[PDB]
Amino acid sequence: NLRNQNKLSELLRRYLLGLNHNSDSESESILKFCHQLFQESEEKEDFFLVNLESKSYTINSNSLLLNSTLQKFALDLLRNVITRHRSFLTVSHLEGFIPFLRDSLLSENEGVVISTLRILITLIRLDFSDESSEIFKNCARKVLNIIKVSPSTSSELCQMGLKFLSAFIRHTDSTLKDTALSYVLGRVLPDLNEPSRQGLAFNFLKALVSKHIMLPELYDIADTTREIMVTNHSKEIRDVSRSVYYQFLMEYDQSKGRLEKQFKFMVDNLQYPTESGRQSVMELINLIITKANPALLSKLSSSFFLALVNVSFNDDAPRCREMASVLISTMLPKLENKD
């Protein structure tokens, strides 16, 4: 039953943890072992006789469950060894496993595929031959097919694909067509309204801005995430969201009317009711103050300064009052004489 499968999963997980500290893991025999696990997975008579059984045996099949379970273990073990010991992360040692990785990618269960994505993300930097390199291109195609069938991006398999898709763009020379990215960003936008389980996608969003790929939806990303900064409560989401939106602003081109509206938001957001929401804006304001063009600072000196003293004059949270006073302190020395 499923419950026992969870129990068996827990036990199998512990064995892997022990294998990590095991001195054998430093030995090369383990790869031959993992390879071993990889290939291991893939009437007239009755008219006389007396029969006295009343219960029929139910048709059932678990042999598939065995193969998936062994494959999940093997992939899980294989990723641990290469991550821990760098020398095994070389082209020569892992050539034999590439055909198995391709099989597992098409494997039904997503847990094994998730592992297949994890190990692949390790190997994107690693060089490979002609036939061992197509796997990266093919896996890029598959994860889009994963996003296809998935009703919602907020699934464990879906995030891991974006993580791979981000790392695919960041490192590998070949890049996907803009239309595919547009749809992926389209699918990310609604599910992004629940950032709590979207943590990986932000890194993929961070990937595109890092490469400065131009998409129409990316402007819509910037507006939604800026709201997430001052609204979502998890600090981790606020931190990553701050980077991408701030990264989006200082690079991507924007019309002058647009620029004022965002800077219009942040000064307004300094009056946000929740203290953390006011706090989360402060780092962004401070980032502008810490690093920005003097001309940009000069246009904004009067606006930011008094919004800062205002909160510093009246604030239900002393810390925000303290931070606002501090940001003024690091503000004034940089200000121009006229400002």
Partner: peptide, 7 residues
């Protein structure tokens, strides 16, 4: 949208 990402 299903068709665009297909290509």
């Amino acid at each position: 949208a299903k068709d665009m990402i297909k290509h």
